[PDB]
Amino acid sequence: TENKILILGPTGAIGRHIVWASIKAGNPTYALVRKTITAANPETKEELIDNYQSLGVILLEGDINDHETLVKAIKQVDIVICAAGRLLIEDQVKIIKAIKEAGNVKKFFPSEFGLDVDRHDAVEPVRQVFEEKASIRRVIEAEGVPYTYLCCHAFTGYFLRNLAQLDATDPPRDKVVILGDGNVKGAYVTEADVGTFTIRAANDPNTLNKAVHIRLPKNYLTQNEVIALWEKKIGKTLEKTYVSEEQVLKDIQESSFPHNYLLALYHSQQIKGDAVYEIDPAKDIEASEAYPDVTYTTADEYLNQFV
């Protein structure tokens, strides 16, 4: 708990859970925030910042686009975590520049928090985003910045909440469309739990220059398994339609943005099985094996709130 952890994008959907997990673990916790007026939702920003301060989070003033403030903030901590959210992937070039100048960073977590971008077979337009993240990995590795790539795969609040259905926010209760045959494993985890595992990884010396993968046993489910789980919960059978990959790919090419992006994301997760792969001990850590003591929220438990 001696590690001082700085969270960039602390008020984002993902970042807030990292901040809270850092506090929970007992780490001195810092959050980079701009003391200027922006278009950020004022209620969320205000509520989160007040909460952070009441918990002992130290606010460091700065902006990813203000090099001087960045270096000054980074010099005060040991670990830097770039939480996925509003921040642009490409702007991590500026963060790395600041890290190199500071010279004291013991570990950098770039804006990953998704699939392992060095292990995918996705199609455009999502393919380019994954490649952009992979390019950042190459910069980090070339620069010799100690790193950890947190590959948490599918967030429950983003994928599971609507059972990967288009134009739906909550789980469907009558009809569902399945991409492919529905027998491809997916990995789900709550945002809160991603915060917990990220901090566990941050405090674990074994994650040095490693990718940490979150594939939790009870949450490693095929779409057919997810649907069957939900059906058991609401006590009724959903009408099902299975669509071939060829038809999905055509749909992506003919759809306007961001619908094509969304479908491409689901294609990679539901058909190509981007959460399915064996790891290399020299470069990967399996969270469920390294941190078996973490009691994660199951997909079953997560869906209970919608019943």
Swiss-Prot record:
Gene Ontology BP annotations: defense response; lignan biosynthetic process
Claim: NADP is one of the keywords in the record: yes
Induction of its expression: By fungal elicitor. Induced by the bacterial pathogens Pseudomonas syringae pv pisi and Xanthomonas campestris pv alfalfae.
Catalytic reaction equation(s): (3R)-vestitone + NADP(+) = 2'-hydroxyformononetin + NADPH + 2 H(+)
Coiled coil residues, start to end: none
GO terms for MF: 2'-hydroxyisoflavone reductase activity
Pathway, per record: Phytoalexin biosynthesis; pterocarpan phytoalexin biosynthesis
Known EC number: 1.3.1.45
Keywords of the record: NADP, Oxidoreductase, Plant defense
Residue numbers annotated as active site: K133 (proton acceptor)
Alphabetical list of InterPro entries matching this protein: NAD(P)-bd_dom_sf, NmrA-like, NmrA-type/Isoflavone_red_sf, PCBER-like
Gene3D superfamilies listed in its UniProt record: NAD(P)-binding Rossmann-like Domain, UDP-galactose 4-epimerase, domain 1
Residues annotated for NADP(+) binding in this entry: G9, P10, T11, G12, A13, I14, G15, R34, R137
Similarity annotation: Belongs to the NmrA-type oxidoreductase family. Isoflavone reductase subfamily.
Function: Reduces achiral isoflavones to chiral isoflavanones during the biosynthesis of chiral pterocarpan phytoalexins. The reduction product is a third isomer, which represents the penultimate intermediate in the synthesis of the phytoalexin (-)-medicarpin, the major phytoalexin in Alfalfa.
Name under which the protein is recorded: Isoflavone reductase
Natural source organism: Medicago sativa
Lineage: Eukaryota, Viridiplantae, Streptophyta, Embryophyta, Tracheophyta
Gene responsible for this protein: IFR
